[PDB]
Amino acid sequence: AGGELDDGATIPFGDKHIVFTIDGHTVKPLFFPGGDIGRLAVSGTVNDLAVMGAEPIALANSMIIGEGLDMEVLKRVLKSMDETAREVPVPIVTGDTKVVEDKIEMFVITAGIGIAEHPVSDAGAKVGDAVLVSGTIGDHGIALMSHREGIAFETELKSDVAPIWDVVKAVAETIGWENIHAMKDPTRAGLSNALNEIARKSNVGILVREADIPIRPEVRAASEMLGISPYDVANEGKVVMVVAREYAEEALEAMRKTEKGRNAAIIGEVIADYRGKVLLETGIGGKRFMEPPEGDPV
Secondary structure, eight states, X not given: OOOOOOSOEEEEETTEEEEEEEEEEOOSSSEETTEXXXXXXXXXXXXXXXXXXXEEEEEEEEEEEETTOOXXXXXXXXXXXXXXXXXXXXXXXXXXXXXXXXXXXXXXXXXXXXXXXXXXXTTOOOTTOEEEESSOSSHHXXXXXXXXXXXXXXXXXXXXXXXXXXXXXXXXXXXXXXXXXXXXXXXXXHHHHHHHHHHHHHTOEEEEEGGGSOXXXXXXXXXXXXXXXXXGSOOSSOOEEEEOGGGHHHHHHHHHTSSTTTTOEEEEEEESSSTTOEEEEOTTSXXXXXXXXXXXXX
8 A cells, every 4th residue: 555663574576575674874973893884784784684584685875974074984984885785795786875064974774675585574483482592682782882981891892783694594594494483683672672573473472581691791791881781772783583493403503603693592482371572581580571671660
């Protein structure tokens, strides 16, 4: 229907499925530990396509730049975008650039198209499935917030920004797309939002063992100083994947064999009770609902 969840849309095309997504990027500063707005723009789009089971086919880039922006800054961002797309690889086939008088530096908006031979969505989780994350959680958002507050560590806290279509493909090549039941790119509102979307869209409950969520020591420390949970901030180089129970170990091992999935872990399982909710277990057995950041409860 003409005219006007926001993770990407699927469009049937004859026998196959085209996935279409768009995302704007307004990160400030433009460069951060581990990356920059250019790498972020390419990685986020690629990751949004990957979690829908779509091989990236093309990216389109719109840049809005302020008149006062130094040409060298622009060149560095373009070089990063080009390099990041080449890691996939996926061509940047078209774009647009606008200059404004406004006192901004640069915004980058990327759209992407992918083709999914075997579509995956956040609505396909099944009871008994294992819930995996491809690596440490909270790195991107905590690294950027930390830098902004002048918080620094011996081992520099960096963003994990990177395209992870390779991590997703590694699992599919091992266990088959049919055994990957759901995925989500844990960007806005982080891991907690991602898990709640899968629980609600698949109409299943999710039980997560808190101790099993991989969190770097530096991220745990910084998040305590910042007063925010690492489960609630953006990740930019991770995937949440729900897989058939009998293939959980194989999927875990496939991810761990990739450089970007080295720290992958099984963090929970899909259940038949509290459908639509995510329950978090403490080491001692304590349980509470894992709610996306903001409202509630008591």
